[PDB]
Amino acid sequence: DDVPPYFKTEPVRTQVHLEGNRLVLTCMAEGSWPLEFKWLHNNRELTRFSLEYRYMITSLDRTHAGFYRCIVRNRMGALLQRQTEVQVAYMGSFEEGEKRQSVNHGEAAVIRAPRISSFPRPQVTWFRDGRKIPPSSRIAITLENTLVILSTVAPDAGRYYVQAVNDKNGDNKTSQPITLAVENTHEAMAPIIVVAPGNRSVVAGSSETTLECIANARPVEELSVHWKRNGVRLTSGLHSYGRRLTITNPTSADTGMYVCEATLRGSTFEPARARAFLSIIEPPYFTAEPESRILGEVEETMDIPCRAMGVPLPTLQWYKDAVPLSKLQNPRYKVLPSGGLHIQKLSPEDSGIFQCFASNEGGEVQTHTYLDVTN
Amino acid sequence: DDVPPYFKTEPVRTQVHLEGNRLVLTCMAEGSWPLEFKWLHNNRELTRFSLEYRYMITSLDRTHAGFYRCIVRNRMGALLQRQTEVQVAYMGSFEEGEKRQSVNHGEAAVIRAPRISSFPRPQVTWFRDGRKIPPSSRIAITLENTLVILSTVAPDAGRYYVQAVNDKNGDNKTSQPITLAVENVGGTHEAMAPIIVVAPGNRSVVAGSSETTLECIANARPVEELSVHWKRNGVRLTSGLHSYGRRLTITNPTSADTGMYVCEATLRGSTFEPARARAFLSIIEPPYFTAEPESRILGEVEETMDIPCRAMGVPLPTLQWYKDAVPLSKLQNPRYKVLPSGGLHIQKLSPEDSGIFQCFASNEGGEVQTHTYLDVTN
Ligand SMILES: *[C@@H]1O[C@H](CO)[C@@H](O[C@@H]2O[C@H](CO)[C@@H](O)[C@H](O)[C@H]2NC(C)=O)[C@H](O)[C@H]1NC(C)=O
Ligand SMILES: *[C@@H]1O[C@H](CO)[C@@H](O)[C@H](O)[C@H]1NC(C)=O
Ligand SMILES: *[C@@H]1O[C@H](CO)[C@@H](O)[C@H](O)[C@H]1NC(C)=O
Ligand SMILES: C[As](C)(=O)[O-]
């Protein structure tokens, strides 16, 4: 008949799978028979066209991770599926050997966790001389799993190793140890920021984002780490002895400059301060779409609308029957600065599916039309 | 040491998995040595406490679907994880053989999709004699994939069957046909009263979702003059309608959209009583805390302690307290009383009262939790 390809059911944008499990992707497309399908991984063809609407992997590997989409096609045109990100849960091995490290007495000893490839990033347990060190007033484990020993004393000399656990597959790995030496001290020590918060960008609508600030001082029991936004002492979302600030449901009211302040209570020392900036990445959305079907007349000049917004400002890109217009290099097609597609001297071969994509760092959206050219 | 258990990371609320794949759940707890763990499935123990922070199913079955959570424990107290819903993707076979069905000429043929169990609910396409059946003015396909042929005629008789495709494991199935017979009766010149052949049901929807849809399909003769209209509080709705007025979609519903909706079918220019059906739409606002306790609390012996916990939501969330992963109803401690606001009220504080107090607020739309560790000193 005369039904162009469309999708009855659309894939989830992101999905996490375990290595060794089976993955079945589906091209849930409808249209006039016969329908043909082919699959793309990271925008590279995996298969030729076929009647097979599925892409199966019996046993997933780290390497299978990335972006998947199908192309459905019949005699009327071709259409890209919304892409889906397969994220494969995996844990490599620790890639570093034994290290030796020294810190001055009273100073913070910073021991980075040895490098390890893992999705997602793992949680860690640090050990001092074979014994678990939970976080405390004097022990900080950063969001990047670094062990910060504040106000180091002689007994802090020892061996430190880290055990990492992937929370999706349960793998655990054990690092090579770090030997820490402490060098020689009764005097108080002004607050210094040892791990500063960094600038942070997060996709709009997310559940939470956490800022972290770790300071040294002595006596550490009188060290006080607090967060200010616009000079306002932040009172909720605090934990980890003041070192972590969780912003829940970050919106524009939460963007901007946060400040962490470290004071040594009761002292005349100057407080230590560090700034950090939070930005919201807003995924793209269309502010204008074409009709699903457009009738055009030969020699007529056509304008197919497509407008998008997003933060950062999205890039718009057109496809005709799953071929990008840049590749077609059709001298009668022109993309306008608003995103709309301008066709002149409309011809019968212009009929087919024109599909618009808008995307930035935060996601991708698509819309499409079938153009019919008669007479 | 002196670190009570808490969770470094909390599991995803819902997760889909394929039958035959490996499931690994984790109890990502922090706390002083020694941490032990145990696991629950639909609030029933699967294991005793052990050093195993993992729960693993080598090959999933449908029956492994449900809610899972761990309890973590050290010498200081015990803490309940936020629960997760494991959904198993599968598709059974069709549970019915060949069916035969009879309608009289001009009556509506309501043909249910043949029963098949599957998660998620499959994509269902209707077919007749090798050809695909599209919705039209006369042909409706309900939200439950029921096929409705309004005002049947002789060409409507035939063999109808569905293709069901599961979009998570990609398995396809084809049912055995329903053979529809159109019987002739000697009054096809006379008009038929409007009748609702597929009624709208009650519907519950979590607030703030983008849209929920009610559906009401009616028959009459001449079906040309049939009118389906939607009314709320006696006033005919003029927007939010689609699919020839058979579908009413409420977009971003709030408490203001709760209540009863009536669909009404008339035969224009007739004096027939209109067919009416009621549907009840409930907007569920999931629970959220408006008050939470401090993460750690130091009380004096003999003190009367008020631990806060307050929640808001529609319906009003019910609050339940645990001490060290034991519900207070099982403890039956006469010094523990839960205030109507939801707060926990402890009188004559005792050294054994020390531990983790965990407050749960839940309704039909979800469950939320907060907790504290209580120290009792002299
Ligand atoms: C749809 O919901 C209404 C209420 O939300 C249900 O009707 C109630 O049924 C209980 C049962 O005893 C009665 O006590 C109430 O008085 C009824 N209320 C009303 C307004 O009728 C109704 O049964 C539900 N119907 C379906 C099909 O779920
Ligand atoms: C950690 O992994 C090793 C293999 O790398 C395994 O033998 C051991 O059982 C695991 N332990 C835990 C607590 O998961
Ligand atoms: C963080 O952002 C500010 C302004 O937005 C910039 O000046 C500063 O250099 C950034 N910090 C970095 C890049 O470390
Ligand atoms: C809901 As899933 C397929 O990311 O486990």
Author numbering:
A (entry chain A): 2 to 185, 189 to 379
B (entry chain B): 2 to 379
What does the report in the manuscript say about this coordinate set?
Sdk1 and Sdk2 are single-pass transmembrane proteins, with extracellular regions composed of 6 N-terminal immunoglobulin (Ig) domains followed by 13 fibronectin type III (FNIII) domains, and a relatively short intracellular domain terminating in a Postsynaptic density/Discs Large/ZO-1 (PDZ) binding motif. Here, we report the crystal structures of cell-cell adhesive homophilic dimers of mouse Sdk1 and Sdk2, each mediated by the four N-terminal Ig domains. These four domains adopt a horseshoe conformation, like many other IgSF cell-cell recognition proteins, but they interact in a unique back-to-back anti-parallel manner not previously observed. Overall, our data suggest a model in which Sdks form cis dimers on isolated cell surfaces, which dissociate to form trans dimers through the same interface when contact is made to a cell surface expressing the cognate Sdk.
The N-terminal four Ig domains of both Sdk1 and Sdk2, and the chimeric construct, Sdk2Ig1–2/Sdk1Ig3–4, are arranged in highly similar horseshoe structures, with pairwise root mean square deviations over aligned Cα atoms (RMSDs) among all protomers of 2.4 Å or less. Two non-overlapping interfaces hold the horseshoe together: a conserved and relatively rigid Ig1:Ig4 interface and a more flexible and varied Ig2:Ig3 interface. These intramolecular interactions bury extensive combined intramolecular surface areas of 2620 Å2 in Sdk1, 2459 Å2 in Sdk2 and 2567 Å2 in the Sdk2Ig1–2/Sdk1Ig3–4 chimera, implying that the horseshoe should be a stable element in all of these molecules. Remarkably, the Sdk2Ig1–2/Sdk1Ig3–4 chimera structure features the same set of hydrogen bonds and hydrophobic interactions that mediate both Ig1:Ig4 and Ig2:Ig3 interfaces. A Sdk2Ig1–2/Sdk1Ig3–4 chimera was well behaved and formed a strong dimer in solution with comparable affinity to Sdk1Ig1–4 and Sdk2Ig1–4. Interestingly the Sdk2Ig1–2/Sdk1Ig3–4 chimera had a dimerization affinity intermediate to that of Sdk1 and Sdk2, suggesting that the Sdk2 Ig1–2 contributions to dimer affinity may be more than Sdk1 Ig1–2 while the Sdk1 Ig3–4 contributions to dimer affinity may be less than Sdk2 Ig3–4, and could therefore both underlie the lower dimer affinity of Sdk1 relative to Sdk2. The crystal structure of this chimera did not show an interaction between Ig3–4 regions in the dimer, although given the variability observed in the conformations of the dimers in the different Sdk1 and Sdk2 crystal structures, the Ig3–4 regions may interact in solution. Sdk2Ig1–2/Sdk1Ig3–4 behaved more like Sdk2 than Sdk1 in the SPR assay: It bound to the Sdk1Ig1–6 surface similarly to Sdk2Ig1–4, and more tightly to the Sdk2Ig1–6 surface than Sdk1Ig1–4 although not to the same level as Sdk2Ig1–4. These results suggest that the majority of the Sdk1/Sdk2 specificity is localized to Ig1–2, but that Ig3–4 may also contribute to specificity.
